Design a protein around this ligand. Structure first.
Ligand code: SF4
Ligand code: F3S
Length: 106
């Protein structure tokens, strides 16, 4: 499974959803997640993320291990997104800011 981590929060560029062949991405107010059961590990999304927030499960940084299980949990409750949309207004102010998990909205 590929996993979306911290830097997607408050950026949500959604470029990853264009490229996903199986549409396994689910949408929240300010963050996106990958459904681990549905992802086919094609890796096409991670070159596409401008925030470089997507990682292969086995490459998730040590300090972002929470995100693996978070993607599995939220993907069960959030709606599927299948079309790109605009980034959040202020996405490049928040791009590269650390510790954005305290701003995650359900
Ligand atoms: S690795 Fe492929 S199947 Fe998984 S979320 Fe990324 S683009 Fe979709
Ligand atoms: S910022 Fe998030 S919405 Fe997709 S393109 Fe990157 S994982």
């Amino acid at each position: 499974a590929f996993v979306v981590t911290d830097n997607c929060i408050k950026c949500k560029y959604t470029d990853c959803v264009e490229v996903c062949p199986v549409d396994c991405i689910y949408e929240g107010p300010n963050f996106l997640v990958i459904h681990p059961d549905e992802c086919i590990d094609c890796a096409l999304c991670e070159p596409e993320c401008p925030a470089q927030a997507i990682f292969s499960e086995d490459e998730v940084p040590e300090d972002m291990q929470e995100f693996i299980q978070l993607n599995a949990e939220l993907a069960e409750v959030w709606p599927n997104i299948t079309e790109k949309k605009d980034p959040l207004p202020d996405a490049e102010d928040w791009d590269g800011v650390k510790g954005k998990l305290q701003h995650l909205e359900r």
